Amino acid sequence: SQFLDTTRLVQSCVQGAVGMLRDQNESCARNMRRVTILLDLLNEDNTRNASFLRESKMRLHVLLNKQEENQVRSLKEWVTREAANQDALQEAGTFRHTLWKRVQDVVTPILASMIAHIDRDGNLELLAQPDSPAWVQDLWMFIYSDIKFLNISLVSFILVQSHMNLLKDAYNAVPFSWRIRDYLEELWVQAQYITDTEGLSKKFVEIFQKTPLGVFLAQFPVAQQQKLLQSYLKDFLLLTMKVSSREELMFLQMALWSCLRELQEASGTPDETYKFPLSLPWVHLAFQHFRTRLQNFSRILTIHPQVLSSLSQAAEKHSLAGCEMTLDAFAAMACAEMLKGDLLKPSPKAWLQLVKNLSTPLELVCSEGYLCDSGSMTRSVIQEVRALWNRIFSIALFVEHVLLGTESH
Amino acid sequence: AFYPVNMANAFLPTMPEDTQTGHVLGSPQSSGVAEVSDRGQSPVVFILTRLLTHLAMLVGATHNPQALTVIIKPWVQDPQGFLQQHIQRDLEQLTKMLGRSADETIHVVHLILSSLLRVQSHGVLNFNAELSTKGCRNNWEKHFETLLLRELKHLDKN
Amino acid sequence: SMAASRRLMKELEEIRKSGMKNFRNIQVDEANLLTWQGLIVPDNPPYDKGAFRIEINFPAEYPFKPPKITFKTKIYHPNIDEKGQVCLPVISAENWKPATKTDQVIQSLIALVNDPQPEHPLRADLAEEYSKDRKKFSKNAEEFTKKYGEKRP
Amino acid sequence: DFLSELQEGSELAEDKRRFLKHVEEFCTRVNNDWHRVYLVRKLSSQRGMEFVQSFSKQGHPCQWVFPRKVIAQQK
Amino acid sequence: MTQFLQFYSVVQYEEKEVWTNLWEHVKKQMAPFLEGKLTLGLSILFMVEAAEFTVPKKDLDSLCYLLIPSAGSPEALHSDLSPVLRIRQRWRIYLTNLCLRCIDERCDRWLGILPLLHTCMQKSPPKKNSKSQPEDTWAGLEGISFSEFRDKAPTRSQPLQFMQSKMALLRVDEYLFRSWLSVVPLESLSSYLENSIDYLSDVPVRVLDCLQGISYRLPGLRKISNQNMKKDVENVFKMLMHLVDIYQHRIFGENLLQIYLTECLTLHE
Amino acid sequence: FLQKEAELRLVKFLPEILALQRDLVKQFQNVSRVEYSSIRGFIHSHSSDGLRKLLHDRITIFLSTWNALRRSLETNGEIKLPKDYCCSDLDLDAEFEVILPRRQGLGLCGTALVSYLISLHNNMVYTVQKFSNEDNSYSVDISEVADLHVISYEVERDLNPLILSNCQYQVQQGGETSQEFDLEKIQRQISSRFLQGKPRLTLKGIPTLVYRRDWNYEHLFMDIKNKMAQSSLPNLAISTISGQLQSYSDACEALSIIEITLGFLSTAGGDPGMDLNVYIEEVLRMCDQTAQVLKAFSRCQLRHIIALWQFLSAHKSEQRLRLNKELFREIDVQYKEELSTQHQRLLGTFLNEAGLDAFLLELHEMIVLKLKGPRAANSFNPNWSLKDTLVSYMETKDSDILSEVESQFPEEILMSSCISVWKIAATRKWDRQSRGG
């Protein structure tokens, strides 16, 4: 309606909304950044920002309408409640300024809770970037234009929480990482309860293709689908496993691309769920089929940080990540080659610490419960890992049994 | 065992500690952990002190069960079957823990009870005979652990 | 907090410049001013054969909340329990006033150690022994000092 | 273990019954009654001597775990 | 389900020849359960949804008598039937399709199929009106546009006789009194409240559901323009006054009073 | 290890109950809204049946862990919980707040159980890394605990064949049978299979719902003092902010603007030059509210904010004093009492020689920062003296006029008559600045 300039009201409430937000007290304090972002894209100039205004005003409509069913109808009459409020009248001067301050103080915590729910980890900056293509803003204004897929509950000094425990200025590349991840894990639990573990991938991809998010992402062409898929790989890996690097995340993302392509090479030729290999739920299928072979790989890069540098040669000398999950085996090769390169130089004691920390993962990898089935190249690499680890561990047993003894006595 | 009305809210042995006097223990048919030994003691001394404690509670409970209702906290129904279940659970834990037969562990219990008679050296002075303070109970624990080690070291040649 | 730390820093400076001649070897980590340790050096018998290490833990809201004092050295005293906690009325929460300085607190505790107050004990058995047979009490306190007390500076 | 379960509780699901029946057929087929002496020593170990005394009554359906002389010469 | 799917997959062969044998079989086994039984109705519902084949009204008389859960009045027997039909989604849409199938103007026996599909969902929402959502979740239908049907020309008054015969069925769940309240016409609604004194004596909380049902029913009607709706709403409110002042404030027990006050304020508004 | 084996058997069940607590934090990040009575009603309040049984399995694991461990929690756990929580066997019809990991009431069950399992695991890993390993920095957070990070085994599958593989049978020529437990070899198998190569958990990312966030205005002040070099107000800026704000509505509007801008400036950075309007109109892009507050703020920078803040706070209250209004309305009635005649004569004796412009400023900031209202008698007993609490507050930060309140101010103002002292001081200030000029 024309009863109140709502755009001026929202732009007035932006600053008081953002000044109530807090992060986890060091997690990229972005208050002035959120102010600049929201005030750049709450205008009527672009049809992008105009449409963002129409759906954001519809979100204020439905959240205030659900908010005011609790009212006792003597607080729904806000003008009459405010004319009887003498102190707010004599604190705001005139009567119309008092009414505008009343609507501002009503909308401001609602706006703050709504921005605290959208801007969960950086979802706003994908609009604040220029030169971002149509899949980004189209999926962002598909998810924000859905009430039932994206609930916004309400509460007063509101905490906005991070989920991806991110670095300096992440801005997660799929327009909402956490809602799609939790929705797909709900679909995972329903998929693995409905069917058995033989048509699980088929039923999971088909129950994804039924939902309105699936039929929204199906109308994208192939290139935007693959770019969203690599973006969802990088941020899903940042969501699940806390990774303290940039290029380790690149190797782990290539590894999960190898896992997904391996799992798509497992089935021969259905070609009805392989009309979408560049689709979201494959990521989850790959993790739920390969979780220990990823998590162990994360631990073998977490105890030993230097070995990544050797892995910084490995894809340059083998051209891996084409068929099968091999980076765990090549990381095993790089760790055993670093231990076979030197044999004596820092001390026996720090090596005992390093071999006792690496004893469990490197022995766990060269076990038939870990290597369930793969290609013959992975088995040849694991056989060489077995032999070289037997050499290194037998030398380690010799050291810890005679050498530290004769270094002690 | 003969004056339970004189144990009116006394600090009973082998009770947890951060006070909480009395016998705050649930039903013996509990799915709980196996009741690991407390602050400073061997498990054999712990389960032996639990076994002697529940037997002396049962000896006092057969005389006047209302005083064992006013000492033991949660139930209101009966002391005798409750302490029989506790002595059953303690014999079960002792026949798991000691590598003997059932009869031979019963002989071990009667051996330790019998051995507690001829141990005439009196040096267990300076604690209240009512179990009224936690220091007196803990000092009793230390001297009785001393005597239990003096008898548990010397059984395999007997 | 830093507000607490500047005040505690000033108080420690003043205490170390004046001296007290009976509370010595105060050691405080500069990164955490809310915990102090020191050595009680009593002047009165039956406690004068040893010294008693204490630790003082100040809450961040000090001086609007009182400090808490614990003893790290075993002592045989009716007003001090077996966990080294002590009842000092001048720093009890209902008696506490913000103007009270740490040196007054220390002088009060040293006074209490040097002259026990059996009427309000943490160890009622020690209080009873003090009241009904002082000779036994003195005996026990001296032997306890010899067996567990620290060596004097 | 099944006999110590047997005195304490109820019926044994028709397959443990067959296993105990085969143990009965084994001990009544061969005269190698040293293993029966071992059986009564094991049952005395797990529960006690009065356990096999309660087995040693006059119509208990576990009498085959005892040799032929210990029952006819028992008052 | 599986072998009947391959049975329909493997089959001058007209499509009515498939339905004729199924109709003959259901007419054969309706008779031993007519006098001397839920599994027959659930099996023939799977079989004729798996046919995509029109049922007759008279065979809607039979399949609905095969589904009405007679002699299942304890809830322990309802918890015993839950693990056969554990997935709460296939059966719910199948029963909802059966509901929409019988919604044409015969529409009398379909109220007894509702106790099956009111146990394979959530409990009764106790919240205030205009807070949860509109009428299909409160009644528990969630696929049925009943609002053209409570507000029409009520030429089919045989639902009140059908609901007169079966009162003890109100003991088998909690959704069914609400859903029976949301199917009755306005001129026969005071008689519906008059017929249910003893069920409210068993549980004095369902009059809050009566207040919520009337606050759901009124604004769907437009402005009152005749003497007929005035007489009808006067009779319903007089029966409501009767059901209030019979019992006690034991109706108001365990702090339900606030919800009664908010519902009567919403009803006044 | 053998001492605490039966409690370390259940560290295997910790990622399931942390999946439970992460799903409850993700679902119920609210306060006073969860309307569920019992656990079985919540489990039946889900429509997706796989999620019902998944939550049923995880809650059965949680109830089994709780029913096992609820005796060591009240005597060895670090989280002190009362005795009405763990004195019964929990079931599916028990209370619903025992599974929501809160920190004050009835939700200390889940949090204390998870923290006690974490403390057991980290104590045992500390024991390993203190005996032989002597140092390790391998430490994972509690946001990505999979199965392979906790000490996990089984007794009937992983312990008993290992222990039976190290009972050695020795027979001498004379004829014996010695069973020996070679404990070194048992150490090498038990160490290098279960409890070595495991992290040392840190308590950062624990799933925890929050009760209520910090509205004491004081975390904002110490954060601005951390980030910025906060100066005092100039003597000309005092005249600037007092001449332009004679209206009450303009003072309230200006104070609202600067509370918003200090909320921004506290938890972020600020250029310590940069005149405060080009922060207002250009950095946080504020529009034109009124020209009067901008002509007021024209001669101020961002290093003045807190002092600037307290001026307008006092200024608002003293406008309430000179317009004859009820001027606090939110503080406790315990602090709102009258002076007696002797106390107000000694107060007037103080005020005859007093720097009122900083005295009543510091006193009004202290009133609206400490004497907030409900739950204010916690550390602020209404029987202390006002002098002692004021010199103790103003020995924390300020390098202001301090000899003046120590040797001449009265020792027995009796703090509970706080704001009437402020009313007398501010009405003397108002008589000086209005009756004189």
Curated annotation (Swiss-Prot), chain A:
> Mind telling me which residue stretches traverse the membrane in this protein?
none
| Signal sequence, start to end | none
Q: State the phenotype upon gene disruption.
A: No visible phenotype. Males and female are fertile and produce normal-sized litters. Mice do not spontaneously develop Moyamoya disease, a chronic occlusive cerebrovascular disease. Mice are however more susceptible to Rift Valley fever virus infection. Mice show elevated expression of MMP9.
Question: Where does it localize?
Answer: Cytoplasm, Cytosol; Lipid droplet
Q: Which domain of life is it from?
A: Eukaryota
Q: What does the record say about domains?
A: Composed of an N-terminal stalk, a dynein-like core comprised of two catalytically active and four inactive ATPase domains, and a C-terminal E3 module. The ATPase regions do not generate movement but rather act like an intricate molecular 'switch'.
Report quaternary structure and partners: Monomer. Interacts with UBE2L3/UBCH7; UBE2L3/UBCH7 is the most efficient ubiquitin-conjugating enzyme E2 for the ubiquitin ligase activity. Interacts with UBE2N/UBC13; promoting 'Lys-63'-linked ubiquitination of target proteins.
Q: What does this protein do?
A: Atypical E3 ubiquitin ligase that can catalyze ubiquitination of both proteins and lipids, and which is involved in various processes, such as lipid metabolism, angiogenesis and cell-autonomous immunity. Acts as a key immune sensor by catalyzing ubiquitination of the lipid A moiety of bacterial lipopolysaccharide (LPS) via its RZ-type zinc-finger: restricts the proliferation of cytosolic bacteria, such as Salmonella, by generating the bacterial ubiquitin coat through the ubiquitination of LPS.
What family is this? Belongs to the AAA ATPase family.
Protein name as it appears in the record: E3 ubiquitin-protein ligase RNF213
Boundaries of the shown chain within the full protein? 3472 to 3890 of 5148
From Swiss-Prot, chain C:
Q: In which pathway does it act?
A: Protein modification; protein ubiquitination
**Which EC number(s) are documented for this chain?**
2.3.2.23
Pfam families for the chain: UQ_con
Residue intervals of the UBC core domain: 3-150
Q: Where does this polypeptide localize?
A: Nucleus; Cytoplasm
Q: Write down which residues bear the modification named N6-acetyllysine.
A: K132
Catalytic reaction annotation: S-ubiquitinyl-[E1 ubiquitin-activating enzyme]-L-cysteine + [E2 ubiquitin-conjugating enzyme]-L-cysteine = [E1 ubiquitin-activating enzyme]-L-cysteine + S-ubiquitinyl-[E2 ubiquitin-conjugating enzyme]-L-cysteine
GO cellular component terms listed in the entry, alphabetical order: cytoplasm; cytosol; nucleoplasm; nucleus; ubiquitin ligase complex
Summarize what the UniProt record says about post-translational modification.
Answer: Ubiquitinated. The alteration of UBE2L3 protein levels during the S-phase of the cell cycle is due to ubiquitin-dependent proteasomal degradation. Autoubiquitinated in vitro.
**EC class of the enzyme, as a word:** transferase
Catalytic machinery residues:
C87 (glycyl thioester intermediate)
Main localization is nucleus
**Phenotypic consequence of H120D:** Does not convert into a lysine reactive E2
Could you tell me the Gene Ontology terms of the biological process aspect for this record? cell cycle phase transition; cell population proliferation; cellular response to glucocorticoid stimulus; cellular response to steroid hormone stimulus; positive regulation of protein targeting to mitochondrion; positive regulation of protein ubiquitination; protein K11-linked ubiquitination; protein modification process
Tissue-level expression reads: Ubiquitous, with highest expression in testis.
Sorted UniProt keywords? Acetylation, ATP-binding, Cytoplasm, Nucleotide-binding, Nucleus, Transcription, Transcription regulation, Transferase, Ubl conjugation, Ubl conjugation pathway
Entry's PANTHER family? Answer: UBIQUITIN-CONJUGATING ENZYME E2
Q: Per the record, what about its domains? A: In contrast to other ubiquitin-conjugating enzymes E2, residues essential for lysine reactivity are absent: Pro and a His residues are present instead of an Asp and an Asp residues in positions 88 and 119, respectively.
The record describes its quaternary structure and partners as: Interacts with PRKN; involved in ubiquitination and degradation of misfolded proteins. Interacts with UBE3A; used by the papilloma virus HPV-16 E6 protein to ubiquitinate p53/TP53. Interacts with CCNB1IP1, CBL, ZAP70, RNF19A, RNF19B and RNF144B. Interacts with ARIH1. Interacts with ARIH2 (via RING-type 1). Interacts with NCOA1; they functionally interact to regulate progesterone receptor transcriptional activity. May interact with NR3C1. Interacts with NDFIP1 (via N-terminus); the interaction mediates recruitment of UBE2L3 to ITCH and causes MAP3K7 ubiquitination.
Q: Which family does it belong to?
A: Belongs to the ubiquitin-conjugating enzyme family.
Q: What is this protein called?
A: Ubiquitin-conjugating enzyme E2 L3
Could you tell me the gene encoding this protein?
UBE2L3
